Amino acid sequence: MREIVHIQAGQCGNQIGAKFWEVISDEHGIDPSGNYVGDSDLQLERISVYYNEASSHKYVPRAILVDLEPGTMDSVRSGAFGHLFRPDNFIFGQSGAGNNWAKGHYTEGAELVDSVLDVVRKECENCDCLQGFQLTHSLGGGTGSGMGTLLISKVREEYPDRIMNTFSVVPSPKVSDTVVEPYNATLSIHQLVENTDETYCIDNEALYDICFRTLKLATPTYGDLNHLVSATMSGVTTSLRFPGQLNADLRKLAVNMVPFPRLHFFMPGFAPLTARGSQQYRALTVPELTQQMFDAKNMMAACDPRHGRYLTVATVFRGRMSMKEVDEQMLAIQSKNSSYFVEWIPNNVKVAVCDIPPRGLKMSSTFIGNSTAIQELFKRISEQFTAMFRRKAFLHWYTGEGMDEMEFTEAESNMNDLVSEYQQYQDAT
Amino acid sequence: MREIVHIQAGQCGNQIGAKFWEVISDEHGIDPSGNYVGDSDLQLERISVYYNEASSHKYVPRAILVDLEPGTMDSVRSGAFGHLFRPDNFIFGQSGAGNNWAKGHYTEGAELVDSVLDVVRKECENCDCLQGFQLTHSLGGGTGSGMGTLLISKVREEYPDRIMNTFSVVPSPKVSDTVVEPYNATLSIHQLVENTDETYCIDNEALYDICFRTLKLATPTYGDLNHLVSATMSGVTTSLRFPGQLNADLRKLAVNMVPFPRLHFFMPGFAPLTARGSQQYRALTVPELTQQMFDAKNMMAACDPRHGRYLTVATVFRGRMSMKEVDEQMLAIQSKNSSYFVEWIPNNVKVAVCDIPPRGLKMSSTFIGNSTAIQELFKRISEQFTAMFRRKAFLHWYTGEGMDEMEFTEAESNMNDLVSEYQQYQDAT
Amino acid sequence: MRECISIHVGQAGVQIGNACWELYCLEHGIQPDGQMPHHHDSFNTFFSETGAGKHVPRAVFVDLEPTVIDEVRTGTYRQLFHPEQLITGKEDAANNYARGHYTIGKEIIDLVLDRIRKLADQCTGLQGFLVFHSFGGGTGSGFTSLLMERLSVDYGKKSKLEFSIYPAPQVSTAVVEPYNSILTTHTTLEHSDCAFMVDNEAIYDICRRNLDIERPTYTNLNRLISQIVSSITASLRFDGALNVDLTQFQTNLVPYPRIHFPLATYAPVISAEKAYHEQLSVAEITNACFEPANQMVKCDPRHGKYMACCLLYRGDVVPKDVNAAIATIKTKRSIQFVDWCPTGFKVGINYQPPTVVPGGDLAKVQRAVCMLSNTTAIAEAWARLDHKFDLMYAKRAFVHWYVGEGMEEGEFSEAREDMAALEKDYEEVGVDSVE
Ligand SMILES: Nc1nc2c(ncn2[C@@H]2O[C@H](COP(=O)(O)OP(=O)(O)OP(=O)(O)O)[C@@H](O)[C@H]2O)c(=O)[nH]1
Ligand SMILES: Nc1nc2c(ncn2[C@@H]2O[C@H](COP(=O)(O)OP(=O)(O)OP(=O)(O)O)[C@@H](O)[C@H]2O)c(=O)[nH]1
Ligand SMILES: Nc1nc2c(ncn2[C@@H]2O[C@H](COP(=O)(O)OP(=O)(O)OP(=O)(O)O)[C@@H](O)[C@H]2O)c(=O)[nH]1
Ligand SMILES: [Mg+2]
Ligand SMILES: [Mg+2]
Ligand SMILES: [Mg+2]
């Protein structure tokens, strides 16, 4: 009931998804072979939302892993946790997009999308009652950004009356992984703003600091970095996967959070984050949980909220608490930190409570804040994209595979408009 | 309830505190591992004042140990009694202040003062009522005096309606540990007399003499020296940690003993002080205890009271007695020694009685006297500072890191004013 | 039927009340937990009756610091008190009058008034308030002056009895006592109907000499004062051949509205071994209580005059030799009364002998005399305490703590001239009147 479709694009999506389906398997008591070995029947109460029933009590995920370059798939197939996926879903192309938008939207986008859309339709018809779509990708790569935009569009005419959540890894200010980031990002964001519902922007170096500073890890690899982002992603969904005292669903989050069609870029955060050695000297209690969430340091996006104002805020608890303690503390937060909240939405705190605590923790929480601190992220990206484009650098290889200058002019004009409306509403009276 | 924050600055504060939390742990029946192993229930009646309740009945002290160099924390962290502090509290820098005021208040202190201040605000949010701050530092070092004053000015801004006590270690008149003492001390006092409520001045040679003749020890190391100052420091606080016939607390002492805003420099003292061998030839009873404290020999500050007059006096008894025997002796002390008391404060004796004896003792006492004889101590220090400053010796390395000539002129101009009023009130009619 | 509520502020009030309420439960034969092992109402005046067999007192324990109330909660008398009435603050006044009357005391005075109103509505024939407050403390002196203002406005004209602890001349535990005592007296001079005074050292001489005790803990001192506290309200809870209720003391011991400062006394107070060698007759306990050395305030009566007196016998007492004993007492020239009071004695007899708690320093006696004297001899103590105040205030010592907590310097001047007026009147009416 209320089934969810999970789509993966680019190298990041497959690596994040590899850690994702690891978390879900432990949550639902699923052996790597694919057979139920747990005890509680509560996990079976709603198992069809993600997994799928099969013969001999086998379970297969509703995931569609697809990427142009094959190199990622041999890793997921040959590696562990590859005995439970559906071999038909393992879609791959022939050559990677090469960090090019054009090769991800016109050249190799044509033949690959037709194949992947077929598996979506078959998966949708198998579904009993569709709830929405989940897409995990990156805005810096070529295949994940370029094709993911194409897939988001092709899905959109097919299911107009549906919602989707895109958990994108937005590029960093400090360190840039690839040289031509702004060309892929600016083009991708223009299309997403047109035809998407909500978007959870996530940074890398911000999660780098969190792992090194708070968890005190000397060598934070991609294994640990992707592990933390999976827990936030599992926390967002678990409201409808598991019963709770004040339940919420993907539809509830979308409407509570998005006041306007063009302002749907969120910023997540998770708590508690404690080291292995320092967990014994801290009291696991709601006061410190909410305090840990509401500081700039424990935030998974590299934008300090102090330069902006929280437009709307969510908080999806887990474990067992009191609504009194939960909402008494939201009062203490609101009264003390009132200078940082937008004046013209009152009571802008949405709270939901579950009952199943996360593994190895008495209780935890997930904070999703639609803030005005993203305006500094888009301003910087637009600045980087502007200077590079005026001198017409790297342009010969987007023009040489389908596009021309009119796409670049209109994408820049739209992005300037969006940051204009974003600021003009923050400074409204 | 009525919690207090304990701050340690410099090497002395860390060394005093390392053995201070030794005596506090025995009083509350705390194993070195951090778990309660005591018997009497009265210990847990007020345990939150110093320790913090945590998961699985573990207790974590409310301490903030900070030094500009890592040479001090290596001992406490690696050594015993280091598995119960919270590692977040173990704040340290990279290079010591180097016995310089500038390198601890202007240049190097500012970098680390933001980290400790943020811990202070985070320190006892769980803590529900602040009673005050307890600071242990030195007036001769660089980090103990330099940034310790920096913390006092900054902390006072955030908690103005609160009282704090600094248990400083005032310099010596016979042997000086560091060559540039008067420059470091005088610059500190000009800032201390403005942002503190009361200061406990303690010497070292006076502690040496007491441990030599009275305790019969020929080679007292720093371990046997700091044990004497811990008991006095624990005696002042234990009024609000344990029940008593006539209770007192930190706020109570400040009212009785600060007649004027600038005259808040006290002189402690402890009794009984008897050797282990010669403990069988004395009868433990109130008669000798009151006589023991009021002689010049058993005084922890090297200033002979006979050259001055007591203004106000404490006697924070412990153990169990009858207040009649207490006031029968305070009457005998007053009548026989009436020449050593100021005329314009009648009945200037404050007495409080507790109900829990110190460890291995039937009864004990703590004497705190806001005597006038301190005026001879500041007279000597201002004499040494004057001789060094006209020659401008050692000064080319104070202006080179932030200061100038005008600052030194005002610090001495204010200090001679303080010794003027400290004596003008003694001779006032 | 007849109701009076007891308020205990400060550590002095709570500690005294722990022993005072320790004695009532023994006079009325109730166990500490409310069960039972003369008796026929009686207990309706102090012990409110719950539907079950348990009785709970009409007490209001209020303090600003929680150190002493927790002793009561965890003490042996834990199931007796009503858990709501034990009101605790967070931190005390730190022997500061300004703190406990302006800043922190104001933030909690509404909570205690709430429980006062709930307790008064539960009763029917309320008469007055018994306040056990000290003088030198912070929450026992400044906070109780606030309660007088709150109680007086709510209840217009009711007797307001106070059992103070007069600061001692030579004994002094606090350093700022002359500042607290002068301030609290000037404000309670108009909202108090009569204030009994007790000196802490005065019992010590009594306990050392008469009791023959070398271990005078605060428990031993507090046990002895509670006997006076109980026996003053002995006629309300017990029948008597000449009953005296709380309203008589207001009109028998208060010749003038300002001069309402009597002092207590108890007799006989003798040990157990000395009990055998004493006959303990009515003619001597009247003489013992009138002796100068048995007074419970460190002021000798010989330097002053007795304005009025009041005796409250109990037990095997005949109203004949009682009449005879006072007859010779008035004749005796050691004690002198004021001219305009030809009769200066009030008597009350009761049929219930006082009881003795187990292990007490006092010995069981079939008779007891409790003497409350309004006298001119207390005027000397006021002048002395006034001398200390003007000495400290001359140099403005300790002033900065008060002015920084919500007072002006002009207020200190008014409290000074007020005590000048009280002291001059205390001797102006005590001197002979011409014609
Ligand atoms: N969080 C996270 N991000 C990653 C990880 N690996 C790569 N990324 C991000 O993903 C981007 C890589 O772009 P992709 O879309 O994966 O490109 P690709 O899959 O190699 O194929 P092409 O687009 O054709 O190059 C980089 O900019 C990284 O910032 C990862 O393991 N975890
Ligand atoms: N009572 C006591 N005093 C000590 C002890 N150790 C050092 N001191 C005093 O502390 C002073 C040393 O200055 P500190 O404040 O420790 O200087 P620091 O912490 O090493 O930092 P720097 O000033 O930069 O060197 C000396 O004058 C000693 O009198 C100790 O173990 N017990
Ligand atoms: N008779 C008697 N007097 C006491 C006792 N305890 C304290 N006192 C008196 O109380 C005076 C001290 O002031 P308190 O009223 O006790 O102070 P407090 O009650 O703690 O309230 P704060 O001043 O705010 O701390 C002393 O001078 C004592 O004479 C007691 O147990 N019995
Ligand atoms: Mg790739
Ligand atoms: Mg050092
Ligand atoms: Mg008190």
Residue numbers in the entry:
A (entry chain B), B (entry chain F): 1 to 429
C (entry chain K): 1 to 37, 40 to 42, 47 to 441
Paper text:
Here, we generated a hydrolysis-deficient human tubulin mutant with the smallest possible modification by replacing the catalytic glutamate residue by a glutamine (αE254Q). Microtubules polymerized from this tubulin mutant contain GTP, are stable, and bind EB3 uniformly with high affinity. EB3 bound all along the stable αE254Q-microtubules, which polymerized without displaying any catastrophes. EB3 bound to αE254Q-microtubules with a dissociation constant of 8.3 ± 2.9 nM, as determined from measuring the mGFP-EB3 fluorescence intensity along the length of αE254Q-microtubules that were pre-polymerized from GMPCPP seeds, surface-immobilized, and then incubated with varying concentrations of mGFP-EB3. However, αE254Q-microtubules still display some mutation-specific growth abnormalities, even though to a much milder extent compared to microtubules grown from previously produced tubulin mutants. We found that GTP-containing αE254Q-microtubules in a buffer without glycerol displayed mostly 12 and 13 protofilaments, whereas 20%Q + N-microtubules were predominantly composed of 13 protofilaments. We found that αE254Q-microtubules exhibit a dimer rise of 82.34 ± 0.00 Å, which indicates a slight microtubule lattice expansion when compared to compact, wild-type GDP microtubules (81.5 Å). They are less expanded than wild-type GMPCPP-microtubules (84.0 Å), or αE254A- (83.2 Å) or αE254N-microtubules (83.5 Å). Interestingly, αE254Q-microtubules show a mild positive protofilament twist of +0.11 ± 0.00°, similar to αE254N-microtubules ( + 0.13°), which is close to that of straight, wild-type GDP microtubules ( + 0.08°) but different from the pronounced negative twist of αE254A (−0.22°) and the pronounced right-handed twist of GMPCPP-microtubules ( + 0.23°).
